[PDB]
Symmetry: C4
Subunit: 330 residues, 4 copies
């Protein structure tokens, strides 16, 4: 799987960049808990069903995706490889997986979107509502299909790895969308009224926040502790997903991320009730280790592992994988 | 117990063969979980009962067995020792334990069955229904007493040990029954209508699959994650057994396997409600380390450990061992 | 506490004797679980009560004891020190703690009892009922106050340490009461009708066995997996004690043993509802390391630790310690 | 965070003093459990609330504090640094955090209180009720705002580190308030009738003790196992807090301590329902490593971490942090 890639990335990247990537907030309690949560989940597979036409495809936000997965927004991809966002966006397009353009992309969102595929745009709320809504309109004018409003960063968590490294953006990595402020529910309304694209709230962990996101007109949420990078001691998304799925009752798409490292982890997420996962760090290890061709290989291996895991679980379709039962281990 | 044998086998076998044997799918989460599940189970022994006539015998599929245990189907036994299946089948016969002939046996099922004893036949479903049913008829014509239909291998799991070893069958190990396709419930019907032998579905983990197996006319099931070799993250059988036993309500025999390493583990399986266990890897460690006499010694040591464990638990009979209570530890 | 003593004993004893002492059955799952069970138990202390007259004394089987504790029966004490049972019995008497004379004592039970104090006698059932009942009468004629009928040894568990050591009784260690058979409930009746002493069944783990022991006229039970020396995978006593206490409802004394290593462990046992503990291995480490004076020092340190733990928990009396609540940790 | 400081303190202090500070009673089961309890607690953060005016302030015992935190009473602060209590009290005052003057302060309580700020006084009950009540009156005459009656030390726990070190007060460290006896509920009444200051019972772990403390006229309790220094095997405070909070139903302030090492730990304590925490050992590591300026820096870092954690959890106020939900991990 992806475990060699992690090493290959540790080798090629300067320590302080691999730390920017790998790290969480505080004591990294939430970073590690993301993995322990997935490792505790056991799937109950079903046997003897028709697998003649096993398909990993889903429809999400009006469109077909090849797998129940999107590339998570990860800022400043030129930190990992000279072609940064463009290499990832190309591989994503060719794998039929959505790609989430960041607000802090090291290439302009217009350029990334011209790559084609299914680009989404991740929004950080700026101090000026008009700058925020102009970023939303640019993304929509540029053909982005969803606004992934990041709602768990009223400010960045305390990253002790980057504080200890005195890490700072190299001169040659820029925020290309530019020549910030806590978001609120009113900020969500402002975006929702400005766009006809689906608004996807990223970083929901409370059941009542899931519910309110539906009330608020979200088309989706991402059940996420931000890869353990925001509140240290935040519950993992994976530990809140089943509850959140039951409370939303079909009222928006429910994605999850944090620690997805395999196809089997995708199967577990789907059996908990997720519509799709986001994968972050692994796509940046592939990017670091081998640029566009590395990301394309990661996405093919993940595509094979999802298909393998589904069929061994008796699931012809992602919808069947959602109906699987689970059992929690120790 | 068997722990020396494991070492003795590691010594004598080429690394890549010991890996074929020892390995599971994916990250081996289900391989390890099989052991953690049994280690969590504590038996509540009963005291002061009559042990004058302690007997480990059971009746299963019309016939007496000496212990609540059969040899699991393990392909290509000539990988482990020159006499392969014949050495194991001889030791099994002389120990009064059923032996499961594989579809991928490295000696023909007719030869293995001529050894006598209580041979069962494990069926992999082939692409051609007529080849499948002809393998069933051969087994029945050859005096096999049960068809162990393996229902958890629509295709083989991803074995990272064998992928990393680029492992492949030596020239001198053949599939002797030959000069494959996902099974379904219709495949089960096809076998059930073709034979009067008991059909035993191997690889059931879902309660509703157990129930349906009874509905379908199975004479037995094996509650099994295939030794952690199929879906990585599949629940252990041992973790589903009690639920499955309660749902079947006596309607077929319920075997379990995965990680049985002692007589006490046999006692635990029986106290959870299993009719019998299958033992896989340990019979191949004995075979590797000492051929027929090694398997016979393993089966005598297991026979002594089962009898010891039963009497220390106050059980004169396997039926009394099924009535024991358990308590789950950490 | 006792942890230095363990080392001091490892130093002075031949490896194979320290193994006779330290060891359990099978994989020692039940030996280790005894410790993990006590370590999981947290006491909820009470504050601000009157401690003016804190007393560790109890009345058990008609008589006062200085602490809620007795010395467990441990065979062949001359293995650990030349004065063997006599050194332990002297220290026990002078500490006001009952001492359990073994059926396999390396000094005659008449000699051990002449030491005075509060000797109990542990009975193994022999093949001949008349030899058994004659051992009971000797103990009673010798002034023993209780018969501790060991009911968890229809035969000795498989001790892999002693099998691997080919351990056997030295020539100079004898069974002094001599110049065996599974006990049953009828054996219990036979003893109960032969003596007016309290009969204490040692090795009860099932709730229904506790209840039946009361029905049968037992004056006590010892909730015990025999220090993990009998069924490997037997639940720890400490894990069944609260349930057993509730089911007996005051109908006999309920002792527990296995892994008691401190006064705080005595407090935990009492807060679970035990009347008293037995301590085995620690009394033999003291004996090995320093003979009679070593056992007397162990008993004084345990006496101080029990008194300390009780007062820090707000308990003036052992009866108050039984009313404490507990909380189970991980 | 504080983890470097711990090392810096280990370096500068004599082993036997760092052990006086770091150590618990018995096997330190309760010392370690304090940390495992906090590490098991996950917060469920809320998103998208107004953080325009995030404030860490609370009102407690009539007065504003800058953070939900006080310095715990820790005896003989001149052990850690020449300025001992005065350095800590100065830093506490300037950080707007209450400081708890000990009965065994190595500077007189009148001197410590002249520093100003929000001094509380911790009371150990003496053999003579009149000495006890005269210490209470001195504290009140000296402008202390609360009496923190320590109710979990009828006598000091067995500190094996200090027994093994034969540790004893250096000649140059004195008990400055001087030129002891178990407290009871009558002792609590005696203090309550002698002072109009709030009486805060420190070392409550039982629900019924919490309730009785309210009945008794306490203004507060501290849910505390005394940093694992008193009963070894005492439940952690953090494990009883939620239950205690629910039982008090607003009837007194409920503080907690034991193992608070960060702002996130403060957030966890508050989400469990605590009014405020006490921090002990970390304030003495800062003191040892850098005297007054070290304590002031610790309090600024803790102040920043609390504010960070609150905002990442969507809490504008400590009252909002109390309403957060939690989820217990493994
Ligand atoms: C290096 C880096 C950068 C980001 C992010 C993650 C990493 C690892 N994230 C979090 C991801 O989208 C995301 O939830 C996953 O990382 C968590 O899952 P995973 O890596 O285990 O698969 C991001 N999530 C977002 O919504 N937006 C990002 O820009 C996003 O937030 C920022 C940022 O812009 O600087 C951070 O610095 C940070 O999150 O710590 N950027
Ligand atoms: C080397 C090897 C080979 C097999 C199998 C196991 C091993 C270890 N199994 C699984 C066993 O029957 C079985 O459930 C036990 O192995 C699991 O228990 P255990 O070894 O812990 O006691 C097999 N179970 C079957 O129903 N049929 C086999 O042929 C069986 O499946 C195949 C195969 O034919 O190639 C596999 O390669 C595989 O399972 O991974 N073969
Ligand atoms: C070396 C030795 C010997 C014995 C026993 C224990 C040890 C350690 N026991 C078990 C104890 O009475 C007892 O329950 C405790 O050992 C378990 O608690 P602990 O040592 O953790 O405090 C014994 N319990 C009994 O009722 N009778 C003994 O003679 C007793 O049983 C025999 C025997 O006679 O040979 C054993 O060999 C054995 O138990 O394994 N003898
Ligand atoms: C070195 C030392 C000394 C004390 C105390 C703690 C330490 C570490 N305490 C316990 C604290 O107030 C307190 O609850 C915290 O230590 C527990 O939390 P933490 O250090 O993990 O943050 C104390 N709590 C009190 O109410 N009074 C103290 O004097 C207090 O009790 C005494 C004493 O006076 O000698 C002790 O020796 C002892 O507690 O073990 N003194």
């Amino acid at each position: 799987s992806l475990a060699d890639l992690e090493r290959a990335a540790r080798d090629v990247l300067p320590g302080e960049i691999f730390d920017f990537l790998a790290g969480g907030s505080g004591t990294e309690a939430s970073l590690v808990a993301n993995r322990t949560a997935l490792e505790r989940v056991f799937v109950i597979p079903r046997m003897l069903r028709d697998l003649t036409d096993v398909t990993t495809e889903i429809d999400i936000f009006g469109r077909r995706a090849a797998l129940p997965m999107a590339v998570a927004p990860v800022a400043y991809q030129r930190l990992f490889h000279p072609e940064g966002e463009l290499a990832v966006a190309r591989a994503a397009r060719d794998a039929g997986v959505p790609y989430t353009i960041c607000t802090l992309s090291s290439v302009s969102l217009e350029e990334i979107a011209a790559v084609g595929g299914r680009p989404w745009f991740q929004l950080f709320w700026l101090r000026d509502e008009k700058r925020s809504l102009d970023l939303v309109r640019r993304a929509e004018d540029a053909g982005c299909e969803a606004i992934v409003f990041t709602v768990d960063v009223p400010w960045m968590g305390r990253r002790l790895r980057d504080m200890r490294n005195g890490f700072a953006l190299p001169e040659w990595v820029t925020a290309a969308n530019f020549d910030f402020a806590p978001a609120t529910w009113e900020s969500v309304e402002a975006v929702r009224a400005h766009t006809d694209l689906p608004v996807v709230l990223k970083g929901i962990l409370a059941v009542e926040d899931a519910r309110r996101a539906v009330d608020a007109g979200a088309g989706g949420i991402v059940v996420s502790n931000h890869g353990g990078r925001q509140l240290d001691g935040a519950v993992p998304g994976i530990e809140m997903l089943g509850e959140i799925v039951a409370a939303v009752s079909g009222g928006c798409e429910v994605l999850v991320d944090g620690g997805i490292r395999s196809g089997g982890d995708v199967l577990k997420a789907t059996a908990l009730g997720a519509s799709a996962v986001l994968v972050g760090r692994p796509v940046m290890w592939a990017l670091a280790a081998a640029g566009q061709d590395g990301v394309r290989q990661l996405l093919e291996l993940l595509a094979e592992e999802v298909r393998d895991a589904m069929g061994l679980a008796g699931c012809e379709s992602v919808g069947a994988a959602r109906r699987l039962n689970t059992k929690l281990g120790v």
